[PDB]
From TrEMBL, chain A:
Residues 76-464 form the Solute-binding protein family domain. GO terms for molecular function: peptide transmembrane transporter activity. This is Oligopeptide-binding protein oppA. PROSITE patterns: PROKAR_LIPOPROTEIN, SBP_BACTERIAL_5. It is a lipid-anchor. Its main location: membrane. Belongs to the bacterial solute-binding protein 5 family. Keywords: Peptide transport, Protein transport, Signal, Transport. The lineage of its organism: Bacteria, Bacillati, Bacillota, Bacilli, Lactobacillales. InterPro entries: Peptide/Ni-bd, SBP_5, SBP_5_CS, SBP_5_dom. It comes from the Bacteria. It comes from Lactococcus lactis subsp. cremoris (strain MG1363).
Length: 559, 6
């Protein structure tokens, strides 16, 4: 398995010893916030650090494309005809204290999120598709009517009844049903308003994973030890320590071999890491897309609809395409990215092999000739005097709301401005400088939208169900440029249709959608990215493969 | 509610 030039796995030539201690860090300049219940946890640092303990008690295995498979802590089965997900917990699925994981523990997850008394931030509208769940969430019902227990609360089976099935229900991270358990017998006497701050969910939790946390130092670290009651394969290691390390100390920690693995390192430090003797640097395709938006309308919040009514030359498809073909994204990546940004051909990242294809062509190759011809054949005629194009007497001049974020953000934005000058388009920065991120978010997300930018960049960390509805549909507030296109709406609906329960049909629908988006060019894909992880050469069985389900049990050290 | 800025 490769990811760009990177290996996905470190194939250690040496055999693992029995036992050993693995030293893992997560790069963060902020303290971790320990919260073992998925529904109550809002800190990405700790979510990742919870890995050895079960990742906040996730139930389901997937393949490398995040499609559910059987054989994890539980199985999930979908039945179209009865509109039901059936969750079957393993007979020997236990909490770390030896107590049984039961149907009630699965249902209780739902209460931690949907009952506002616990203070979760994780309710989504998607959950309203479970029968009875909205009524629970608003306090109209004392129980969740769509969740039933064929063999009782102390049984191992849970049925979840939906109003409508969705084809994304076979992908982890779909959000239509939840994928974690909570130890109801351990927590049932804690007041909901006190659950998040209780020892029992912070320093002294029950877990289901291959390791349990023997010690938690708040903000800093976890000492993991084998969980005797884990249903699966007993781990090789005697322990794992998992700590936060600051950005400024990460490279030195590798130099001294303080950590066997550091997770979450940022793209800029890669040049300092690549050279380090004693480490293998692994890479993996990220669940990430960056793209360029054009401002084409406004958002009507009252009616929840994007209206594509902005006066701008970007209403012309030829202009949108030309501005895309003019960029030198490949060249930019080659100068600056260390192979960690690679040009996007489409809106769906290539890690989703079941939902995209490299055969989709976008704007990944600069074509200044094509850009110039497009503007020509559309009446944007160049000047002698100025080097810029005019049409019905008005100059082709646009505002670029570029933003701070990338370590060469200023240099990249200027490079694009210069490329656009080559095709006779005059582009200037919004207020003559890069936008701060919080400014940029406010500008793009406050309805009805501003009229004072033409081009901007966005970048998303995608869930493992790569839903496009929430980003680009006619009703989406995140449709930042406010396009509204009947063909794209049809394409989006087809992706989520009953016909798309068939994987081959769904792939085709995703592919058509990506083609249509590139042609229409309301937005332009910019980059995919790779994540990297340095791994000490003594570690055995380490891999970034998303389909690797037992890495914490398999991983060992050679000395 | 699935995807995040980043």
């Amino acid at each position: 398995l490769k990811a760009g030039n990177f290996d996905v796995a470190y194939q250690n030539p040496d055999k693992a010893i029995k036992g050993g201690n693995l030293k893992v860090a997560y790069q963060s300049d902020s303290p971790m916030k320990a919260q073992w219940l998925s529904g109550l946890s809002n800190d990405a640092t700790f979510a990742t650090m919870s890995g050895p303990g079960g990742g906040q008690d996730g139930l389901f295995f997937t393949d490398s494309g995040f499609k559910f498979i059987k054989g994890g802590a539980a199985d999930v089965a979908l039945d179209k005809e009865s509109k039901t997900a059936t969750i079957t917990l393993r007979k020997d699925l236990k909490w770390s204290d030896g107590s049984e994981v039961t149907a009630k523990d699965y249902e209780f997850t739902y209460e931690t999120i949907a009952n506002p008394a616990y203070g979760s931030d994780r309710w989504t509208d998607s959950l309203a598709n479970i029968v009875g769940l909205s009524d629970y969430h608003t306090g109209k019902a004392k129980t969740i009517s769509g969740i039933t227990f064929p063999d009782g609360e102390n049984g191992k089976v849970i049925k979840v009844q939906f109003k409508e099935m969705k084809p994304g229900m076979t992908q982890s991270g779909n959000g239509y049903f939840l994928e974690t358990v909570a130890p109801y017998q351990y927590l049932k006497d804690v007041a909901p308003k006190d659950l998040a701050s209780s020892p029992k969910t912070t320093t002294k939790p029950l877990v289901t994973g291959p390791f349990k946390p023997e010690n938690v130092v708040a903000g800093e670290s976890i000492k993991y030890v084998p969980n005797p009651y884990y249903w699966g394969e007993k781990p090789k290691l005697n322990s794992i320590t998992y700590e936060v390390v600051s950005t400024a100390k990460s490279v030195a920690a590798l130099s001294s071999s303080k950590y066997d693995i550091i997770n979450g390192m940022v793209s800029s430090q890669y040049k300092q890491v690549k050279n380090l003797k004693g480490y293998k640097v692994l890479g993996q395709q990220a669940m990430y897309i960056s793209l360029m938006y054009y401002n084409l309308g406004h958002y009507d919040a009252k009616n929840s609809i994007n209206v594509q009514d902005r006066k701008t030359p970007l209403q012309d498809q030829n202009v949108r395409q030309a501005i895309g073909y003019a960029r030198n994204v490949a060249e930019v990546d080659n100068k600056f990215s260390n192979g960690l940004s690679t040009p996007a051909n489409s809106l769906i990242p290539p890690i989703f092999k079941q939902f995209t294809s490299s055969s989709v062509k976008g704007y990944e190759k600069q074509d200044l000739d094509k850009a110039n011809k497009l503007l020509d054949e559309d009446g944007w005629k160049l000047n002698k005097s100025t080097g810029y194009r005019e049409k019905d007497g008005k100059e082709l001049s646009l505002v670029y709301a570029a933003r701070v974020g990338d370590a060469n953000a200023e240099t990249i934005a200027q490079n694009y401005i210069q490329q656009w000058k080559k095709i006779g388009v005059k582009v200037s920065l919004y207020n003559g400088k890069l936008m701060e991120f919080n400014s940029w978010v406010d500008h793009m997300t406050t309805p009805p939208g501003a009229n004072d930018w033409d081009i901007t960049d966005g970048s998303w960390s995608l869930a493992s169900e790569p839903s496009q509805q929430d980003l680009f549909s006619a009703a989406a507030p995140y449709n930042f440029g406010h396009f509204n296109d009947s063909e794209i709406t049809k394409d989006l609906n087809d992706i989520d249709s009953a016909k798309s329960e068939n994987p081959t049909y769904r792939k085709a629908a995703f592919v058509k959608y990506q083609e249509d988006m590139n042609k229409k060019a309301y937005v332009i894909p910019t980059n995919f990215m790779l994540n990297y992880t340095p791994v000490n050469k003594r570690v055995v069985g380490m891999t970034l493969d998303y389909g690797a389900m037992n890495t914490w049990s398999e991983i060992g050290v050679s000395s | 509610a699935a995807a995040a800025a980043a």
